[PDB]
């Protein structure tokens, strides 16, 4: 039988370590024979697993549209996902609006603020000898930075996370769509505020932008607010969560990063290749053949980046975290026109989070009396990472 037949990104079998990795490795093995397979989940769709097959699809925008970027579609009411859910020429026009603020140069001005914030966060529990690395640190670092970027209150991470939960999971329609509406209500308030009292944040910038000389509609602005809050907060928190979990038990990886801080940027890349949370969809717009498979219009193809990132044709020793790996052309941040807008930013956030955490708490391990939990979906990673460590001292407060 085939692992593709029941492949489902929201229901990936977990191995004894609590991750979907044993399954990903088995699927990677089958993909060497069958790089694309049909899954009966979600009414029938294609699962693209080979690295070259994903390349092939992602590069063919004529036949594979981003109208199917999320599948099943994320709950955003009547709003489309800004940039992510569009094809050119529309997609390019909107992305040029936010390209500067997201340029490495524009985000790098937050680097030291990130370091300080990460250290202030660690201070909150270093004296306690225990904490859930995901909720205490991984969820907070990107949520607080994203907040500041969008001109939102850094302290309300919990309300933002609830909106994301609704958008990506919450199985009850009414629920998910009603909570997404709460995000919309808040966006509208924020937009009206910035309209009169502009700031230096990204929302203020797009609010004052124009396409074809005309100002953006409130719907377009809510669209930007949404995709940026989701991007900045979801995958980033699940990726950092998975990295803290890995460093909690992998004493070998951990000691090397402490001994060779200079290898951290490279390691972050390798860790992005191994724990990349994302899987993305494409809507088929015309008959197209990729490998042995011919897809039909209206069908959906899911790009299983985690499998391709383990393709022996593209990576030597794919199942090992080789921190000195270079070049590392993983597909965790996409490729082509939809590349992740937040690529440099997640790299800096991880670099900073890892560096300061290991500097502050070099010794720690998973809590033997509390459970870890892995969230599945289009953005997958550890949701809870209870750890313990010797009690330490705050830097401030
Ligand atoms: C671990 C962190 C992250 C991962 C693994 C990730 C992954 C991705 C992937 C796979 C794409 C391309 C989707 C496609 O091919 O259609 C993408 C798109 C996008 N990401 Fe990220 N992302 C992450 C963090 C971020 C951050 C920090 C932001 C917040 C600004 C962000 C903003 C976006 C945007 C706006 C797009 C749409 C790009 C376009 O369609 O042109 N991402 N991301």
Swiss-Prot record:
EC numbers on record: 1.14.14.133
The organism that produces this protein has a lineage beginning with:
Bacteria, Pseudomonadati, Pseudomonadota, Gammaproteobacteria, Enterobacterales
Q: What is one Gene Ontology biological process annotated in the Swiss-Prot or TrEMBL record? A: carbazole catabolic process
Q: How does it assemble?
A: Homodimer.
Supply the alphabetized keyword list. Heme, Iron, Metal-binding, Monooxygenase, Oxidoreductase
The UniProt record gives the binding positions of substrate as 235
Site Controls regioselective substrate oxidation: list residues: 235
Q: Which InterPro entries match?
A: Cyt_P450, Cyt_P450_B, Cyt_P450_sf
Protein name from the UniProt record: 1,8-cineole 2-endo-monooxygenase
Q: Name one GO molecular function term.
A: oxidoreductase activity, acting on paired donors, with incorporation or reduction of molecular oxygen, NAD(P)H as one donor, and incorporation of one atom of oxygen
Question: What this chain does, per the record?
Answer: Involved in the degradation of cineol (eucalyptol). Catalyzes the initial hydroxylation of cineole exclusively at the pro-R carbon to give the (S)-6beta-hydroxycineole. Cineole is the natural substrate of CinA.
């Amino acid at each position: 039988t085939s692992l593709f037949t029941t492949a489902d990104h929201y229901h990936t079998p977990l191995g004894p370590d609590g991750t979907p990795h044993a399954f990903f490795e088995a699927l990677r093995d089958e993909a060497e024979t069958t790089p694309i397979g049909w899954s009966e989940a979600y009414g029938g769709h294609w699962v693209v697993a080979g690295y070259k097959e994903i390349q092939a699809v992602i590069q063919n925008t004529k036949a594979f549209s981003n109208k199917g970027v999320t599948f099943p579609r994320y709950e955003t009411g009547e709003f489309e996902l800004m940039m992510a859910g569009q094809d050119d020429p529309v997609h390019k026009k909107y992305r040029q609006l936010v390209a500067k603020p997201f340029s490495p140069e524009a985000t790098d001005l937050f680097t030291e603020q990130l370091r300080q914030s990460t250290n202030d966060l660690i201070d909150a529990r270093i004296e306690l000898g225990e904490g859930d690395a995901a909720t205490w640190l991984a969820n907070e670092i990107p949520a607080r930075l994203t907040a500041i970027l969008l001109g939102l209150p850094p302290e309300d991470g919990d309300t933002y996370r609830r909106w994301v939960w609704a958008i990506t999971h919450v199985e009850n329609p009414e629920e998910g769509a009603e909570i997404f509406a709460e995000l919309v209500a808040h966006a509208r308030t924020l937009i009206a505020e910035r309209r009169t009292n502009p700031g230096n944040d990204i929302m203020s910038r797009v609010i004052m932008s124009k396409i074809d000389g005309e100002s953006l509609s409130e719907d377009d602005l809510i669209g930007f607010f949404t995709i940026l809050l989701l991007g900045g907060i979801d995958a980033t928190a699940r990726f950092l969560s998975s990295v803290f979990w890995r460093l909690a038990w992998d004493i070998e990886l951990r000691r090397r990063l402490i001994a060779h801080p200079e290898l951290i940027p490279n390691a972050v890349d390798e860790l992005l290749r191994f724990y990349g949370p994302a899987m993305v969809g494409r809507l088929v717009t015309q008959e197209v053949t990729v490998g042995d498979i011919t897809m039909k219009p209206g069908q959906t193809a899911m790009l299983w980046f985690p499998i391709a990132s383990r393709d022996r044709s593209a990576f030597d020793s794919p199942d090992n975290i080789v921190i000195e790996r270079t070049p590392n052309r993983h597909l965790s941040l996409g490729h082509g026109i939809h590349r992740c807008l937040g690529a440099h930013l997640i790299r800096v956030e991880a670099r900073v989070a890892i560096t300061e955490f290991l500097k502050r708490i070099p010794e720690f391990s998973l809590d033997p009396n509390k459970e870890c939990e892995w969230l599945m979906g289009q953005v997958a990673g550890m949701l809870h990472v209870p750890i313990i460590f010797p009690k330490g001292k705050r830097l401030s407060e």
